[PDB]
Amino acid sequence: EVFNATRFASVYAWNRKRISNCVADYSVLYNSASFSTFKCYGVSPTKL
Amino acid sequence: NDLCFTNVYADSFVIRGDEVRQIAPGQTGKIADYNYKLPDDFTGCVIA
Structure with missing residues (x-):
């Protein structure tokens, strides 16, 4: 959901996902x- | 120029454009973990 993300947020109103x-x-x-x-x-x- | 080297070795491989950063001590990925890993106390230069 984070990486392939077909509709992906803009930079002025960015998205925060927990x-x-x-x-x-x-x-x-x-x-x-x-x-x-x-x-x-x-x-x-x-070390990640 | 002013140094004189003792034991030199020329590695040679082809990688894609995104993985040039991976040929460095401490970097990870599928080119610096499964293909070609540089030592942490490396002394030399990578030319790409």
Whole structure:
């Protein structure tokens, strides 16, 4: 819902979605999607 | 120019445009976890 997002919010009125009660499998994300800037602040991508 | 090196090695691979950032110490993805990982105390330069 976050990543493929067919109707996707504008920048002047952006959308905030709460995520709860699940597991964050990062390996699924880059199977079919390529991210240009995966900048991470405060938390290293290795220890995510 | 003023240095003289002892043990040099030239890695060689083709990656897509989004994954050039992944060839760096500490970055993750499907190119820096499953294909080619650079050491944390790396000393050299990546030319793409």
